[model samples]
Target chain A: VQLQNVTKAWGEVVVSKDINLDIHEGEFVVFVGPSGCGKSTLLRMIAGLETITSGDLFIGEKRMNDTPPAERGVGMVFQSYALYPHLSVAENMSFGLKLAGAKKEVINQRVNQVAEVLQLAHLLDRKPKALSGGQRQRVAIGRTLVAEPSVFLLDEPLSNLDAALRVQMRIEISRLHKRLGRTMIYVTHDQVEAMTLADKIVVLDAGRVAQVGKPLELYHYPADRFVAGFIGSPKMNFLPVKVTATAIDQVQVELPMPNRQQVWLPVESRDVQVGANMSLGIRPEHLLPSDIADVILEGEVQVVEQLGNETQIHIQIPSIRQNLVYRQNDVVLVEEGATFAIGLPPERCHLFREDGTACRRLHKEPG
Target chain B: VQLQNVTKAWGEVVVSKDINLDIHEGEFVVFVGPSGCGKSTLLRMIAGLETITSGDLFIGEKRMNDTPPAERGVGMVFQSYALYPHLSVAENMSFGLKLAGAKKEVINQRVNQVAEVLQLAHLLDRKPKALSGGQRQRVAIGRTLVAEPSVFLLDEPLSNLDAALRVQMRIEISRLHKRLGRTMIYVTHDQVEAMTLADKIVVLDAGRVAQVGKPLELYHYPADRFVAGFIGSPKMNFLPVKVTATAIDQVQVELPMPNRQQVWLPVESRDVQVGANMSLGIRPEHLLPSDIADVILEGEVQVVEQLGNETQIHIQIPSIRQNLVYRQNDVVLVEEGATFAIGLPPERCHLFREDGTACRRLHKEPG
Candidate 1:
């Protein structure tokens, strides 16, 4: 499947702008963005539900812009299960096939096979109201599976489930993608879901594609500040800094603290100059213990949350707009109003220019 | 506030049964459980929206089971926000005071104060439709705040917001509780919310109080198998075991693996005997690296989730109904279908007898 310069607009309002993507067979792709960012609009266009205003869409070397939804070789599962409450599980799974004038024996066989795959065979006779939220979601997926489409489009299919159930269903969906070896494009606002399930991720921001890459590629080497903060939990802490020196392969920036500490980052010096204002990005987990850090930062603790497996400390520094968070894998005993010190490693730091574009890092990251 | 033998029933259906609790002043208490577990029902009963079948409710040395909701000195916020679309922020907040015939001057003063605290003073004249979801929720909270109730009850107030917004609101609510120093009771099914916000946590299961303790206390020392599985993410792994030896302070159990390895747990042996079937419980984080473990177990890896800051490895071992998850605090390069070895620390093990009651651990946990 391919989208070449695809765009969607209504009169003066544009929802999806100039999109170009290539989805290979059996590859899992995910679209993620904040609400109203056109992630859903892009998915609908591929499914033939929303007409593209310009450009081309190709599926298996054939143009599909004018094709009807049913003939597009794509199936979509919505956030709401949308199952018929009065219909049994088997009936729901076989509804599409029956409507397409398929033979009764063929519909029955396909429904049975998909039901077995989803582990819904035992509850084939249960109505939607009688099944749990996870079960109903599975039935909806089974409904799509029985159609045997070349590509599966899921739009927030697990959003309605509780946290624990969502985790279980996420794994089930990943396993299903692997077993069936079919192309899948999923759209969600959950960071963990996008990071864990996607072979390639498309990040949309305000109707434009921000970055497209593998999960870890986006995490370790985000193209801009938006992707940097959107991909991590508790977000990446961004602090105002002044560039002290610029080298071919490194940039030295002054931290906005009492000591005015300076550190060198292994990022390209392109579009950066000495004494210019920039932003430093650091993840909470990357902040190490003070004893092992190349540079030290001190702040007043504002809030401390102990999550049994880890501890999260929110601290207030001098010039940072938002509180900087420090995450420790083990339990840490800290008071809410105490002064604390944390370590910062120069190798883990990121530098962004005035236009939000990240200075490319020269160091190689883990795969 | 106290609930002595509280029960709620409608005809033959009992929703809440024998709920007993003690809430101190200026404490943040949370009720958490799965759906149909009566967490919301218990909160509604405390707010006087539901009738108590047979119980005594006391507030500051006064029994108020028959008192009307308005006279109970409690203010409640619903999950839906329930803001009037036509009313402005100030009008919505002052509605309760207006109904009580408070002076115009007094209502204006109270509304201004509450709005300022919620950072909604600039939007006081805007209607609910013109505000964002988080702003509307703050208006709902401001409505309750103007009443100046002694106790505040929130029913899943943050469930409607997006993930990032929810995290910000959680911190705001925590800061609000600290500034006000008022008694608060919150209800939700989200484990992270319950763990981070509550000073005391009430674990409810099927309308009954399963356990009452601080968040870390419940996580480290669960009273039963149900609480053990309910309190954590990915849940605690429970493996079937048979008691091989019993002593005054410890019990030896045989693993169901091919080698039939035996290990001792530092728990009481009051209800265990030789050859008795029991369950061994361990958290994902407690499963350490093979080099640091006291005992070793091997399994086939089923899934590997890289969460940037942590890696979650799911492994399937023989005779285990559910896969055992091992969590490491860094990126781990492992593939599915590979044999992996993990270590188990004897001190972190939990034992449960046939009746589901936990055998008390002899070691003390961190505060």
Candidate 2:
């Protein structure tokens, strides 16, 4: 499926900018952004729930911009699992086929096939009230699966379930995607969801696409400040600085420290201006408590979260406006009131300009 | 507060069995269990909403079993924020004081003090409808705080919010607990809440106390099969086996692998019987994909989840009924359909008997 310069607007207000995306056949794509970023609006355009104000949408070789949702050959599941409460699981699975005037044998065959795939055969006689939250969701997807759609759409389907159930269902959905080999597009506000489930993630911000890439690509080498902050938990810490020197392979940056320490960070420089204000970004996982480093950040620990597997310590840095969170993957001890000297590796640091555009990262940090 | 021989029963039906607990003042304790485990019922009993069948309840050395809820000096925040939509934040906070006929000066002073603590001082003039869900929750807590109760009781207060909002509010509640320095009792079905916030967590199952201790204590060394599986994510993996031989400080067991490897494991042999069926429990985080190990179990990789910082891979073990999950703490690549040799360290492993009792961990494995 391809979208060519898609735009959605109402009078003077615009909900989506000129968006162009190519979703390969049988690819698992996820659209992720904050609320009002038009991620859902873009999905609705593909599903024919909303009309495109400009540009065109194509499914396969067909120019079907004016096609209704029923003719889109796409099955959509909502966050609410809108199933018929009075109908049994079998009935719910076969209702769409019956409405479309499918033969009785065909409906029964499709329903049984989907029921077995979703492991709902034993619960075929059970009504919606008798199913658990996860089971209800599987039935909802099963109803859609029975109607052989080329594309599948899910809008925060796992958001309503509990954490454990969500994880379990995520694996189930992943397995389902593999078994079905259908084009799937999922939309959510959760970065972790995008990272775990998507083959390609489209990061949207304020009705515009910020970046589109694989999960680790966006996590390791974000294109801008918004993508960097929006991709990771605890967020990448950005410290304002001024460029002291510039070259093709190295850019010297002056850090905001008491001693005015300047460190040369390796980068493939383009349009580098000396003495220009910039920001240095580093992930919390990359920062470590060290004693042998030349540059040390001293901070007092504020909040300590012991998560069994790891401990997340929130430290109050003196220079930054927001607190710096340091993640340690140890079942060791942590003191909430202790001060620490954290080391930042220049090789792992990222450089961004005053306008939030990131410099091209050197091609060393590969997966 | 203390509960001595506490029991709740309706005629012959017992919701809570005999429970004995000592809750010290200014302690943050959490009641955690699944639905129908009577966790909420126990919390309600402490709040004087449910009567104790045969036990003595004490608050600061005073018996509170026969006291009314209004005179119990306990404030409660429910899952739903039951605030008056028409009432302003300050008015809602001071509503309880007004109903109790407190003086205007005292009401104003108490409401302002609680609002300041909750960072809701600026929102005091805003109505409930004008505030966010988190703000409304804070207002509900502010109403409770205005009463100046000695103990704060929260019943799944974060359950109603979405995931991101729930996390933000969890941190807010944690900070509130730290700021107030008052005795707080919380009830939740989510174990992460119990792990991160509670000074002591009480794990309940089948209306009986399974274990009660610090979060890591329950995590690292679960007392029984129930608490072992309940406390951690992905749950603990339990492998069933028959004991072939027994000795002091050591026991020999055979796995259901292809080669039928026999390994000697450390155990305190008290009720050890030859040929008795037993189980071995290990957490997903403890299992690593090691190359050089004598007792390596092979499995086909079924699912791989990459969450930016870490990767969780689920493997389908041939002999096991359920899949075995192993986690790698890096942005490493993993093949989905390949076989892997996973190693389980003997020292980090836990042994359980047929009766679901775990052997004590002897010493520490320092990092």
Candidate 3:
């Protein structure tokens, strides 16, 4: 499945612009971004739920631009589940097949098989209202499963469920994708979901694709600052920096402080100029102990959160506009209103230009 | 603020049963649990939104069970902002003061002061519809803030915001609490919020207070199976075990595998008997490398999730009914369909009896 310069617009307003994506067969691809970033619209356009204003969509070498949703051989599961409340689980699962004039015996066999796979066989006779939120979600997925589409399109399928159930369902969906070995296109605003489930993640910004790559690639080597900030939890701390010197393979940047500390970043210096303002990006987790780091930053601790297995420290650096977040595994004995020193591993640092494009890092991060 | 034998019932259905708590002045207390756990009902009871069926409710030293909501000197914020669409930010915030016939100058002063604290001074004239979700939520908080209540009651206040906005608002709310230093009672089902924002966390189960302690205490020493499962993300994994031996301060249990490896836990063994079925609880993060652990368990990797900063592997042990989740702090080079060995640190294990009561751990966890 693939999209080539796909655009969805209403009069003068464009919801999706020049969207291009290649979803490989049997691969799980996630479309993720903030709200109003055109993730859902792009998924809808591919599913034929929304009309494409321009460009071509192809599935298995066949153009689907003019194809009806039913003929596109794509099944979609919405966030709402949208199960028929009056209908029983089995009936809900077989509704689409029955509507498409499938044989009664075939529908029953298909529904039964899907129900067993989803562990919903016990609740098959129960009405949608009787089933739990997770059960209803499975029935919704089973409804699509019976159709046996070549590609599965899920638009924030677990958004309605609580956090725990969402995590459970996320794993279930991942397992389902593996067992089915069908192309899956999942759309969600959740960074964890996109990072964990997708074989390839397409990070959308505004109405365009910001970056597309394997989860680890996007995490370690984001094409731009938007992807860097979007892919991680607690977000990547971005500090404004000034380029002091530019070498062929590395750029030396100066931190914003009274006694400016110069740190050399192993990134492409082709587009960087000396004395130009840029941004330094580093994840909270990457901030190491002061004793082990090449560059040290001191800040006053604002908030210290002890999350059992890990500790997150919100540090207020006078020179930086935003609080620098420091996270470490295991509980860290830190207190608010105290000065804390954190180390920045130069290898883990990311550099973004004024245009928000990232300078290609030379570091080879472990997969 | 205190509750003495607080109980709320609707005719024959008791929503809260014999609840007792002492909320310190200028402390942030969070009530957290799954849906229908009476967390909101308890908060309402304290706020005078719901009457305590039979109990002594006190603000300071006075028993005020029948005190009206306004007379209780407590302000409440709901999951829905519930701001008047027609009213501007300042007008919405000052509505409560105006209803009480406060002087117009005093109301303006209060509104201005609260709005400034909430960083909503710039948007003071904007109507509810014109404000973003976070801004509207802040307006709701400001509405309560301007009332100058001794205590603040928030019911899932950040639930309506998106993930990124929720984190941002969570931080803002934390900072607000610190600046105001008022007694606060926050309610939410989100574990992160409970762990990060609360000075003390009250885990509710059914209509009862399951446990109450500082955030880390609840995380490290949950009182029972319910609290153990509820406090953490991905949740604590429970494996069925059988008692092999009972010592004074420790109990030995045998794993379900054919080898039946015996593992000793540093929990009280008062109620344990040889051959009695019990549960061994261990968090995903506590599972260590096989080479460094005392007890090793082998399982087939059912799912491998690469979370960039960390890796979560779901392992399906043949003898165990549920999958065992193992989490590591960095990218783990592992794949699904492989046999994985994870070590269980006995000291980090939690033991639970059949009745859901916990055998108190003797091992000390760092704060």
The top-ranked prediction according to DockQ is 3
Error of 1 at B69 (Å): 7.5
Query: How do all models score by TM-score?
Result: 0.83, 0.77, 0.81
Better model by lDDT: candidate 1 vs candidate 2: 1
lDDT of 1 by residue, A175-222 (tens): 788878899999876777888899999988868889999998988889
Runs of candidate 2 with Cα error greater than 4 angstroms are A1-15, A35-71, A83-85, A88-98, A101-142, A145-149, A160-164, A288-294, B1-168, B180-193, B202-212, B257-268, B288-304, B313-323, B334-342, B364-367
Pitting candidate 1 against candidate 2, the one with the higher TM-score is: 1
Question: How far off is model 1, as Cα RMSD?
Answer: 4.7
What is candidate 2's CAPRI-style docking category based on DockQ?
Answer: acceptable
DockQ ranking of the models = 3, 1, 2
CA lDDT, every model vs. true structure: 0.82, 0.77, 0.81
**Candidate 2 chain B minimal-lDDT segment of 10 residues:** B97-106
What are the clashing pairs of model 1? Answer: none
For candidate 2, the TM-score of chain A alone versus the native chain A is: 0.92
Please give, for residues A93-211, the per-residue lDDT of candidate 3 as tens digits. 78878657899877898788778867777778778755444467678888887887788998766643446656767767877787879999887767777887888888887789898
Q: For model 1, state the Cα shift of residue A333 in Å.
A: 1.0
Could you list the chain B TM-scores for each candidate?
A: 0.92, 0.88, 0.92
For model 2 the local lDDT of residue B145 reads 67
